Amino acid sequence: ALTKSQTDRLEVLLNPKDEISLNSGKPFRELESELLSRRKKDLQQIYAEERENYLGKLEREITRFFVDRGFLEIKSPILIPLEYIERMGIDNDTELSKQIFRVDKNFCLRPMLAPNLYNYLRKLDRALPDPIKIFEIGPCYRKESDGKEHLEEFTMLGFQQMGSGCTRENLESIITDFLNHLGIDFKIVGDTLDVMHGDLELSSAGVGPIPLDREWGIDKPWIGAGFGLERLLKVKHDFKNIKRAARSESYYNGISTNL
Amino acid sequence: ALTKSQTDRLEVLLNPKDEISLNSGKPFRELESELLSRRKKDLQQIYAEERENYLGKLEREITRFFVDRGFLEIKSPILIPLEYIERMGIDNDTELSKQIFRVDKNFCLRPMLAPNLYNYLRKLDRALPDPIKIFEIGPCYRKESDGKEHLEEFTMLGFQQMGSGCTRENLESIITDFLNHLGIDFKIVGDTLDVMHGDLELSSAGVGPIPLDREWGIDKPWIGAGFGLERLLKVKHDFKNIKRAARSESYYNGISTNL
Ligand SMILES: Nc1ncnc2c1ncn2[C@@H]1O[C@H](COP(=O)(O)OP(=O)(O)NP(=O)(O)O)[C@@H](O)[C@H]1O
Ligand SMILES: Nc1ncnc2c1ncn2[C@@H]1O[C@H](COP(=O)(O)OP(=O)(O)NP(=O)(O)O)[C@@H](O)[C@H]1O
Ligand SMILES: N[C@@H](Cc1cccc2ccccc12)C(=O)O
Ligand SMILES: N[C@@H](Cc1cccc2ccccc12)C(=O)O
Ligand SMILES: [Mg+2]
Ligand SMILES: [Mg+2]
Ligand SMILES: [Mg+2]
Ligand SMILES: [Mg+2]
Structure with missing residues (x-):
């Protein structure tokens, strides 16, 4: 019989497509060598x-x-003024x-x-025609409890359209085309809406105006x-734990690097 | 005559290709409107x-x-254990x-x-054939004095080959092909070498083995x-200040966003 530690080691080495039964009575040292x-x-x-x-x-x-x-593709600072957090309506409640990683004062x-x-x-609303459409991909940081679905260092896609055409139907159509294009199954539940894969949250979406907009100089x-x-x-x-998808030294494309 | 402040404002708005003379005697309000x-x-x-x-x-x-x-394209953590710094031979000297941005303890x-x-x-040396060739692009952080050539948040390309073919000639040939392919003028001065554009350092390159390698389990x-x-x-x-190339809210592709 394999120990819990030996099976831990075997499961790090196991890929979702693997057809291997750990439970079959073959010895750890040989299962590990395969x-x-x-x-x-x-x-x-x-x-x-x-x-x-x-990830790239x-x-x-x-x-x-x-x-x-x-x-329009945006690349904006990762290290931001702490006051942007309070201005987002996040004030100790x-x-x-x-969850904020603080860096200096x-x-x-x-x-x-x-x-x-x-x-x-x-x-950009002073320079570009209506509607204004932008997006960003890059690192984001949150302190989290260990989880199968949470990383402290992850990568977020964010997109926003401002002006005409800002209806909930159009927003669902972008989400739907986007995930059908990547081949990711989802359902939209709900103005705020969530895009879910089973019980896993893929995305949180929103329709404005909302009152927070005026702190940022937005009135559209x-x-x-x-x-x-x-x-x-x-x-x-079909990874079991999100740390196989993370920027990491332990996994390359979900394959363990401790061989 | 324009004030220093008015010319500061005009130069934020000025692109290297612009054929405009600030010095010609036209009024600030009109130069700014152009x-x-x-x-x-x-x-x-x-x-x-x-x-x-x-940048993207x-x-x-x-x-x-x-x-x-x-x-091989690598994406590895941006937030790293502080002990990696001491192990790089950087110990308060x-x-x-x-220059280290510290995050927790x-x-x-x-x-x-x-x-x-x-x-x-x-x-990867336990899994891949000789030579082993990897590279990474992503954010790096250093506290710096304000400078025309320094950002606190920048993006570094790093590449490394390990094993056979690790000669200084081959390293110069990669650097030379790489910068000729992007259209960036340079000269290589020097095993450690630097790639310079005038007095600006584009890169620092190196040839191992060096004694630091053994702390990291490298003997090739x-x-x-x-x-x-x-x-x-x-x-x-031909930007004059590197902050036009940075991840920023003030510049998009070197064009000011404060219009
Ligand atoms: N710690 C994390 N690790 C990985 N992805 C994350 C993390 N936090 C948020 N995301 C993703 O970013 C999206 C937008 O962020 P947001 O809706 O604010 O997250 P969230 O509400 O905290 N989701 P969750 O914390 O899992 O209940 C989420 O729908 C997730 O897909
Ligand atoms: N603060 C910075 N902002 C932008 N690029 C940087 C910065 N620091 C380093 N680099 C780039 O990263 C390369 C490799 O890093 P490294 O050789 O360690 O920098 P460096 O020795 O501090 N150069 P410098 O500080 O300008 O004298 C440099 O050759 C630069 O092209
Ligand atoms: N709330 C997340 C996701 C996000 C990004 C951009 C716009 C958003 C609009 C509505 C809901 C979430 C949005 C964030 O602030 O990054
Ligand atoms: N010294 C810089 C640049 C760099 C990256 C990777 C390998 C390097 C090898 C020699 C010289 C600089 C190298 C760094 O540690 O990121
Ligand atoms: Mg959360
Ligand atoms: Mg959410
Ligand atoms: Mg330096
Ligand atoms: Mg250097």
Whole structure:
């Protein structure tokens, strides 16, 4: 019989597509030698044929999608003024207030894209025609309890349209086309709405105006949504734990690097 | 005559390609109205035609280049254990020790890619054939004095080859092909070498083995280099200050967003 520790080790080495039964009575040392061999070949094939990282590749695919549909690609600071958090209505009452990674006296690691997108919408509205369509992909940081669905360092897609066409129907049509294009199953439940894969939250979307808009100098209708890229990789690759999709030293494209 | 403040305002609005003389005796309010109009049209053209961000686009171009030449694309944590810094030989004697953004008791924002690349080289050497070729693009953080060439939040390309072919000639050939492919003028001065554009440092490269390798479990020859992506955009777009190339709310593709 295998120990819990030995099975822990075997499951790090196991890929969702693997047809191997741990429970069959073969010895740990041999099961481990089989899986070690498969995982080295998986890396060898990636290195020989494609060489692209899942997270980077997904970011590039999402980028082409939104560029093609008319959204301006934004890259804004990751390290943001701590006052952007209070101005988002997060002031020691919300769960998120205690999730902030603080950096100096006045800065933090952004936990969300909304502040920077707000600022870009206000600024670009003096220069661009209606409607204004922007999106950003990049790192976000939140302290979390260990979870199968949570990382402290993750990657968020955020997009926002401001002006005409900001209806809930249009927002659902963007979400629907976007996830059908990546091959990710979902249902939309709900102005605020959530995009869910079973009990896993893929995204939270919203329809404005809302009263928070005036703190940021926004007085137009808008629609938007945020998606976590690692949750999407988790679903499309059927990973059991989101840390196989994360920026990490322990996993490459969901294959363990401790061989 | 224009005030220093009025010329400051005019130069934020001025693009390197602009053929405008501030010194000609026309009034601030009119010079500003001309430049405001040009800068809005620049944004309108980007929004109508391409919609890609300079930093993101450069990252994708560098990615294709290195993937095509056989380097595995890495995305590793940005928030790293503070002990990686001491293990890099930075222990309160180097300039870099005081440039570290510390996050908790035990973590920091990475100022460099070398620790994570080291760890990937050691790990992948059990699985991949010789030579091992990897690269990473992503955020790095250093506290800096205000400068025309320094950002506190920048983007670094790092690449490393381990094993056979790790000669200084091969390393120069990668650097040379890489910068000729992006259209960036340089000279290599020097095993440690620097890639310079005038007095601006584009990159620092190195040839191993070096004694530091054994702390990281490396005992093979290697070659590598690090490049700052914003320094490259600065040179190729002839920006005067690197903050036009940075992830920012003040500039989009080097065009001011305060119109
Ligand atoms: N810690 C995290 N790790 C990975 N993805 C995350 C994390 N937090 C949020 N996301 C993703 O970012 C999206 C938008 O953020 P948001 O709706 O504010 O998250 P959330 O409400 O905290 N979801 P959750 O914390 O799981 O109940 C979410 O729908 C997730 O897909
Ligand atoms: N603060 C910064 N802002 C932008 N790019 C940077 C910064 N620091 C380093 N880089 C880039 O990263 C490359 C590799 O890092 P490194 O050689 O350690 O920098 P460095 O020695 O501090 N250069 P410098 O500080 O300007 O004298 C450099 O050659 C630069 O192109
Ligand atoms: N709330 C997340 C996701 C997000 C990004 C941008 C716009 C959003 C609009 C509605 C709901 C979520 C949105 C964030 O602030 O990053
Ligand atoms: N020293 C920088 C640039 C760099 C990255 C990777 C490998 C390197 C090798 C030699 C010199 C610099 C290298 C860093 O640690 O990120
Ligand atoms: Mg949460
Ligand atoms: Mg939510
Ligand atoms: Mg320096
Ligand atoms: Mg240097």
